[PDB]
Structures are given as C-alpha cells and as structure tokens.
Design an enzyme around this catalytic site. Structure first.
Site, PDB file in Angstrom:
ATOM      1  N   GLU A  97       0.830  -1.206   0.000  1.00  0.00           N
ATOM      2  CA  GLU A  97       0.000   0.000   0.000  1.00  0.00           C
ATOM      3  C   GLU A  97       0.867   1.260   0.000  1.00  0.00           C
ATOM      4  OE1 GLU A  97      -2.796  -0.429   3.255  1.00  0.00           O
ATOM      5  OE2 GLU A  97      -4.065  -1.815   2.111  1.00  0.00           O
TER       6      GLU A  97
ATOM      7  N   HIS B 288       7.751   3.896  12.675  1.00  0.00           N
ATOM      8  CA  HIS B 288       6.392   3.374  12.573  1.00  0.00           C
ATOM      9  C   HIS B 288       6.268   2.263  11.533  1.00  0.00           C
ATOM     10  CE1 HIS B 288       5.822   5.883   8.927  1.00  0.00           C
ATOM     11  NE2 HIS B 288       4.808   5.072   8.685  1.00  0.00           N
TER      12      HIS B 288
END
Lengths: 314, 314
Positions: A115, A257
């Site tokens: 993605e 992250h």
C-alpha cells in the site's frame, strides 16, 4: 487522524526529512517544490523555511482544510498552496506552474511496497518534474536476514493446534501466509543481512513494478534454528543534498512506525555456521484484491532441495 | 485476519462466553442457536458441545470458508451450519427453521456503541427469536469516572503547541475531539465510578438507539486535577444461565481488546474531595458519516457553570 500524529512523532523519519531539506537551503532557495501526501504540512513548512519560492502540497485527505490553517498560522500562506485529490485527477498545478524542481514524498509502505504511494510519485515525476530535478528521497534499499523466533512462532502459529480442546489447525496456513509487521530484537538475528532490492526513483519505470523478481543470499552465523526471515528498508536522499541523508527502518537503529516485516517459515531451518541461504523473492500486486501484495519465495540451504513459500500481505 | 486471533486470544471475553455456554448444557440441549458474527467459529463450537440440536452461524467475512473447515475437523458438520452475508439479506434460515431459541452475539464495539453490531442483533432478535428466548449476553452497562492524566495529556494534546518551532495549535481541537481507545491504570482514577447507561437486549428497541440521552454523576475523592473522563462497559449473561455470568472491560480487572475509552477535557478540572461532577452524555450516529459516533457532554462541578464538550469517534 492518529495516522498524522504517528507520522510526525516518528522522530527518525521526520528528522531525516528535516535534515535533508533544511540543511540544503542553497538547493531549495527560490525553487518550486511539489510535496505528495503533505498531511498536516510539516514537510511543506520545512521546504518553505528552506527558501522555496512555491510549495505545492497534495493530499487526498480531509486534513487539507486544517493543514491550510497551520500554513497560515506560521506565515506561509503566500508560499504553500495545498490541493486535494489524486495526482491523476489534477487538471493543472496552480499559478500556471508547468514544471517543478523538487518532489518531496513519503511514499514508503510497510515492507516498502505494501500500500505504498510509489505509483503516484512516479506519475507526478513523469508529469511535472523538470529534467534533472530531484526527488526527496530518491533511493530505498531492502534488506533481509534470518532470525530465531521460536517463542513468537509457538504463540502465534502453533496456538491454532488446540483452542479450548478444539483443533483449529485449518487456520495455520493462513496464519503463516500473513507477514507480521512488528519489531524484532537485533539479538534474534542469526545470519548476515542481504541487500535484495533497490528502488531508484530517478530511473525506475511504472512497468518495472508490475512484477519484481529479485534474488537474495545470506549466511548463517550460528548453530541455531531459523523460524523466520525479517525484512526492512533503508531510505536515502541521494541526488540533491550536499551530503547524502539516510535513515533505516531496521532493528539495529531506533524504531520507526514501519517496524520490520517478519515472514514466518512453515518449516524451521536447522542452520550451521557458514550455511548459505539463497533464493528469489517475487513481489506483485494480488490478482483478486489489488491492494494486497503477493510475496513468493523460493530458496535453498547449501543448494539442497528448493523450499518454496507464498505470502500475501492484506 | 488478525482481528480473529485478537478476539480469540482475548481470554476474559472468550472464557466468559465459554462459561456461560458450557456450564448451561441443560439450557442448550436440543435447542436451536443462532450466532451473529461467528468468526472462526469458537462460540458455535461451544454451543454445539453444550448439546444444541442446530447452531446457525452468520458471518459477513470470507472467514466462513475456513470456519466451515474448522467445524468439520471437530466433528460438528451435522450440527453447525454457517451462512455468509448480512442478517438483513437472508431470505430464510436453513433447514426450514423459522424461530430460534438462543441468540449468541459479540456485538459490543469500542465505547460499547462505536461500530457495534447492536442493530443487526436486534433485527435478528425481532425476526427469529422465539417469545421468551435468550440472548447471550443480554445486558451491557457503561461506567464513567474521572482520572489524572497530565503526562499523557501533555504528550498528546500540548505536543501540537510547538512542532519543530512551528505552531500546530490549529490541530489541538481535533485532537481533543477524538476519544482515545487505550488502557488506563486504576491508580489514575480520582473519582467514584458512575453507572450511566444500560442496554438490555431483551427489551431495547431500534428507535431507542437513534439518540441516547443519559445522565451521569460521580464524586471526587482527592485534591487533584482531572484531565480526562474514562469509560468502559460490563457485560452480563443475565437471562438464561443458571448463575449470571459477567465480565468487565474496566481498569480494575484484566485487560480486554476493548481497552477503555478516554475523553480528554479541554480545561482540566481542579477537584477537591467530595466535589460532585454531574451532567448528561448524548450519543448519536454522526450526521455526515454514519459510521462515526457523536458524543456530547454537558456537566457541572458542584452546580457551577455548565461545561460542554463534543467528541466524535471516527
């Protein structure tokens, strides 16, 4: 919502962008900068502070309305212009701009390619980047190695053998097929690390992304069992900055992250020191859900029989 | 995918359902059971093991194909029948069944009501539950109290005052408007706890859910600053089981995947011991995104001026 606080509070990432932009005021002075996926606008603010003549931010998110307020509150409403929508739906850039000097983007997804906004960034590069212009960042490299992870494999895979007495083993394959986004401790790594993919935004073409076939090779350092491969990527601002700026998502440096990506093996590998694990990784958009990534590996240990395993991140 | 492992590995929840079902074999023997949102099928397996004649599981998820395999592997393919789709799209139940004796569901969302399956469960109850039939569970109660949380408020709200020198305060309101799903330590609670809502599946009607207006009241136990209210819910299998079965999502007992819900206050309350915080909470589906929950509070401290704050979980 919280994704923007998570992106900003990712210190390793935002500091690397801050350094690449603000230490290169000479390069940004009076330039036209396009930032893809501006979010709350911090990267656009950096580019403006670095002296850009015009900063155009695109974000498809409704965050744009608040981001405009942030731009105004910091005195840059004449420099930074924000536009909603997809790059592919933009008639023209504002102020009659036809080409830009610098494209900033944070296109990298989990496992670099899951993605990601890579295709959007390449469209914007093809449409608007002037010959010789710069992409911040422009180079990502992927690394892979083997780890010991018997505890997490037992808790996450073998858990399905017996669930309140019931046999849930039909689920085990699906659990194995899903790569895990999580942190690994560096003490778990039991092999050298293999560079297995480079993505150079200066030269890569969209047709190259249809199916990525690549090879990898790493060497065992221990007499140990290998339960999983772990992959991460490094990101370099290479062309443009006076000194290259780099950050890593690997386990030897501060967490990001993106974490790391853990590929559990169906059958543990019994490794000896100096054993060689070598093979190919094929990466492609899933054929029935285009947001899903198919990741297929085939490999050998010292040239033994080929082991193959298919994964889907979804 | 991982949501099913998270639901199953939620020990507090799955044990409470296991106890409510398996300790009531007398009630399940030869009955027709409907389970809404069967997932990988563990609750259907419990109902079958408890002696149900027929267990019908509905899940809208593609997990159904693997769940059927699990049902087969545990020897219940003649008892448990799984159906895909929404309750609202089901022509008839299989085997010509027109009414069911027991409805099992796990409809509770975050903050009990956020993206819950409550309306689906009520439709299934209205369509199929025989008069006097049972809902497992049938009663949820919501509690709220005040906490000290200056550290997390400073890290999550005041962070936006200054972001690399830039003023991001335009974002602060949005950060305050979003309730946080997270665990709170019980040592942070500085007030008594207030029951403020009960949802009884035996009697509640869908029109009652259009807008929930309720009141709350709790009392300060300390000379302290209150930065947030925290809410949770308790769930009871009340009608049906021989002894009521209960579990809590609150901070005084083992954590669950629901965590707790933290509502940060715009202005900290300076509380004295025995101060009374009393007000109303209004809960309603958001008018522009139906998946979003609007939560509006108005309250006083010892009858002072009314403080009002609106939240949206999205």
């Amino acid at each position: 919502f919280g994704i923007h606080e998570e992106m900003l509070k990712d210190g390793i990432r935002t500091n690397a962008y801050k350094n690449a932009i603000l230490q290169n005021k000479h390069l940004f002075k009076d330039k036209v900068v396009l930032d893809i996926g501006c979010g709350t606008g911090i990267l656009c603010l950096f580019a403006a502070k670095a002296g850009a003549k015009r900063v155009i931010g695109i974000d498809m998110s409704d965050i744009i309305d608040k981001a405009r307020q942030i731009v105004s509150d910091n005195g840059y409403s004449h420099v930074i212009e924000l536009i909603k929508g997809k790059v592919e739906d933009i008639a023209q850039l504002p102020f009659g701009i036809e080409k830009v000097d610098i494209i900033i983007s944070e296109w990298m997804g989990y496992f670099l390619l899951y993605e990601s906004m890579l295709q959007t960034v390449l469209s914007a590069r093809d449409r608007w980047l002037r010959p010789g212009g710069y992409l911040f960042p422009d180079k990502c490299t992927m690394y892979i190695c083997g780890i010991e992870d018997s505890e997490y494999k037992r808790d996450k895979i073998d858990f399905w053998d017996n669930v309140y007495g019931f046999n849930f083993s039909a689920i085990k394959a699906d659990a194995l097929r899903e790569p895990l986004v999580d942190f690994v401790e560096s003490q778990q790594i039991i092999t050298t690390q293999s560079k297995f993919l480079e993505i150079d935004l200066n030269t890569i073409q969209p047709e190259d992304l249809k199916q990525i076939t690549t090879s990898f090779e790493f060497t065992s350092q221990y007499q140990e069992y290998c339960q999983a491969f772990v992959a991460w990527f490094d990101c370099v601002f290479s062309r443009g900055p006076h000194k290259p700026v780099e950050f890593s998502t690997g386990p030897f440096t501060e967490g990001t992250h993106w974490k790391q990506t853990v590929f559990y093996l169906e059958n543990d590998l019994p490794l000896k020191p100096n054993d060689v694990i070598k093979g190919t990784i094929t990466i492609s958009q899933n054929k029935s859900n285009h947001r899903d990534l198919d990741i297929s590996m085939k490999y050998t240990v010292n040239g033994g029989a080929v082991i193959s395993q298919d994964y889907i991140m979804r």
